[PDB]
Ligand binder design. Structure first.
Ligand SMILES: O=C1N2C=C(c3ccc(O)cc3)N=C(Cc3ccccc3)C2=N[C@@]1(Cc1ccc(O)cc1)OO
Ligand SMILES: [Co+2]
Ligand SMILES: [Co+2]
Ligand SMILES: [K+]
Length: 185
């Protein structure tokens, strides 16, 4: 995994601007943790028929993850502050990675994969792409599976998706480009 960050690269800025705008469903330039956690729990976990325990675990992981980029309940965050939060989160996560401490993105991944049970099939990923809305095109979800190193069944493991996520969200690793097909630049 490419470990050096690239926070001034316009492509890294654009990646997160795309995601911010995707979360800013009402187009008012600000998002809150409340909205993110409702998306996680009331929308995604409900549609995935997660158990109450799984929903709660996933919520704790989403809360931790987005608190790591500066989000908080009731705190209206616009994109520049959000991105500064992501620089902090990425930095912290890479330190955890280096010291063999589980990352917040790994723990969120554990919670997502457990709802789908540490492997996800392509059909499960296609459903996630639609339900979370991050990648509603099934072709882009096929791209994810082509892109990643899959297990012997052609399923995706959380170790691999975690490595890919480090490169995609944190370091702009060329080896992670295309993780979400054309769904996320
Ligand atoms: O990584 C992921 N995400 C990153 C961002 C995101 C949001 C803002 C940014 O600036 C950058 C990235 N938004 C969402 C979708 C989501 C957002 C909010 C609440 C619930 C879900 C999202 N879903 C994940 C979940 C996941 C995590 C680990 C795995 O191993 C597998 C799957 O897979 O794509
Ligand atoms: Co394993
Ligand atoms: Co192999
Ligand atoms: K592959």
């Amino acid at each position: 995994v490419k470990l050096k960050t690239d926070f001034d690269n316009p492509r890294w800025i654009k990646r997160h601007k795309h995601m911010f705008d995707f979360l800013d469903i009402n187009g008012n330039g600000k998002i809150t943790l409340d909205e993110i956690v409702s998306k996680a729990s009331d929308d995604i976990c409900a549609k995935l028929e997660a158990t109450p325990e799984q929903t709660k675990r996933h919520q704790v992981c989403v809360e931790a993850f987005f608190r790591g980029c500066g989000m908080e309940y009731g705190k209206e965050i616009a994109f520049p502050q959000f991105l500064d939060g992501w620089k902090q989160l990425a930095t912290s996560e890479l330190k955890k990675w280096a010291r063999n401490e589980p990352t917040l993105i790994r723990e969120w991944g554990d919670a997502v994969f457990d709802i789908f049970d540490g492997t996800i099939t392509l059909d499960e990923w296609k459903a996630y792409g639609k339900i979370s809305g991050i990648s509603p095109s099934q072709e882009d979800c096929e791209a994810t599976f082509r892109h990643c190193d899959l297990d012997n069944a052609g399923d995706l493991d959380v170790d691999e998706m975690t490595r890919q996520h480090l490169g995609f969200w944190y370091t702009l690793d060329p080896e992670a480009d295309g993780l979400y097909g054309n769904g996320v630049p």
